């Protein structure tokens, strides 16, 4: 009994999912992670954490992400973040607290009894009992056929149909729970293999493994997945199953049992399962290819020796005084590598941009904080193109609802690049920041 307590203590100390449960900001993190799986992740996490001060932002988000990566909650391959089984387990536990489909049903008992009978019949090697069981089943089927031909077609009740639908959905949707587990097992097997190779470096083992074309990364989960997908490759029963499901879906009791998302999930079981099964073979192939490429490099002995030397240096580094500037600035002995030259031998595009102009005009309006007409705005911010700007200001004024007067004229003199003069007979406008502060552009 105490062994259970010790194991619980160890699990609380170690398992990353429980640590995520114990995290203070678990709700936001879980919401973000669940939404994403349906670099930029840091952006989304910071944006979500923004309007949740209550109770840095970028720095704290990065620190949390790196801590979780160190905790192996998520993995990083080249530039992308990928999930593990623990994330899905935690998500399931969290969202299961709302509503759970009951299993203690008579229909489940019937299915269990049928499966038990099937197992007991299948495991028997006797050639006589199987024949007797087949005869009994045929006799029972003939009795049922005679009773049906007597006019006793049995139609189940409403509650019975609802319970059957719910149980079928519950049992069917559980096929996709083990996918990440196989990938995690393959990754950990690959890491163990690389550690063994580097620890060993012996070239004979590398040559033998490269010569051998046998599949590496052998785990029982791989064999189970292979058998499952091999039986899944037979579409003959898949078509019948899909047709039966689509026939079932057209029943008046459906809206009373399953919501829209459940019906959508049930409608496309077969193709989705096939595609998901296919999606793992590419990952296995890439893992094997990367392992073989790493083996062909033949630098394991080099890395082993350099690691040993670095460990020796870092062991020596604990016997020096880093509190002295003179010692820290004492030159060492390292030849110059990659020495460059000694500096010298000692001898109608572009057009117009709108966003920048809008932002600068907004900044001027907010900094001045007073009504401004077109003349002053032109003076403070001389334009490159005289047109395409007056129109923009007038459009902003009209859209914002700020009134524009046309009975009076303001004369603005502009000079282009090639000298000369132009005069604009603009009407009068007054621009303020407060009115237009809440309109997108």
């Amino acid at each position: 009994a105490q062994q259970r307590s010790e194991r619980y203590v160890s699990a609380r100390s170690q398992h990353p999912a429980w640590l995520l449960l114990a995290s203070r900001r678990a709700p936001l993190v879980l919401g973000c992670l669940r939404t994403l799986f349906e670099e930029d992740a840091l952006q989304a996490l910071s944006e979500m954490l923004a309007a949740y001060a209550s109770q840095a932002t970028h720095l704290q988000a990065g620190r949390e992400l790196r801590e979780w990566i160190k905790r192996r909650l998520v993995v990083e391959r080249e530039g992308r973040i990928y999930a593990t089984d623990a994330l899905e387990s935690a998500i399931q536990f969290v969202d299961s607290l709302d509503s759970r489909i009951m299993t203690s049903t008579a229909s489940r008992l019937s299915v269990v009894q049928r499966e038990i009978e099937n197992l007991e019949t299948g495991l028997n090697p006797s050639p006589t009992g199987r024949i007797a069981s087949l005869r009994r089943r045929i006799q029972d089927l003939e009795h049922e056929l005679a009773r049906v031909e007597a006019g006793h077609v049995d139609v189940l009740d409403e509650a019975q149909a609802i319970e059957g639908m719910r149980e079928v959905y519950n049992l069917a949707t559980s096929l996709r729970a083990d996918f990440r587990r196989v990938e995690d097992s393959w990754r950990e097997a690959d890491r163990a293999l690389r550690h063994s190779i580097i620890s060993e470096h012996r070239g004979e083992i590398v040559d033998r493994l490269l010569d051998g074309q046998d599949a590496l990364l052998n785990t029982p989960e791989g064999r189970v997945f292979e058998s499952f997908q091999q039986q899944l490759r037979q579409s003959a029963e898949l078509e019948v199953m899909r047709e039966r499901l689509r026939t079932i879906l057209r029943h008046p009791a459906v809206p009373k049992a399953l919501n829209r998302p459940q019906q959508r999930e049930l409608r496309w079981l077969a193709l989705r399962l096939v595609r998901e099964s296919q999606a793992v073979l590419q990952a296995r192939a890439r893992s094997e290819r990367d392992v073989r490429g790493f083996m062909k490099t033949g630098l394991a002995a080099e890395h082993h020796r350099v690691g040993q030397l670095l460990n020796d240096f870092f062991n020596l580094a604990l016997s020096v005084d880093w509190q002295r500037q003179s010692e820290r600035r004492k030159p060492a002995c390292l030849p110059p590598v990659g020495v460059a030259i000694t500096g010298v031998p000692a001898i109608a595009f572009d057009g117009l941009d709108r966003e920048a102009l809008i932002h600068d005009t907004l900044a001027v309006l907010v900094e001045q904080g007073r009504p401004v007409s077109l003349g002053e705005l032109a003076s403070l911010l001389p334009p490159a193109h005289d047109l395409e700007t007056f129109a923009l200001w007038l459009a902003m004024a009209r859209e914002a609802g700020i009134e524009v007067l046309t009975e009076e004229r303001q004369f603005v003199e502009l000079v282009d690049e090639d000298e000369q003069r132009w005069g604009f007979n603009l009407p009068y406008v007054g621009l303020d920041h407060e009115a237009l502060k809440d309109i997108d552009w």
């Binding site: 047109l387 007056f390 007038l394 459009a395 009209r398 046309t406 604009f424 603009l426 009407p427």
Partner: peptide
């Protein structure tokens, strides 16, 4: 094409609509 327009034009009329109403404004240059 406002760049080419400015070469061979001497006036402009801007039409803007807000809500279900519209309005016109006149300009010039020289």
């Amino acid at each position: 094409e406002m760049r080419l327009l400015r070469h061979h034009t001497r006036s402009a009329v801007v039409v803007h609509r807000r809500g279900v109403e519209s309005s016109l404004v006149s300009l010039s240059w020289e």
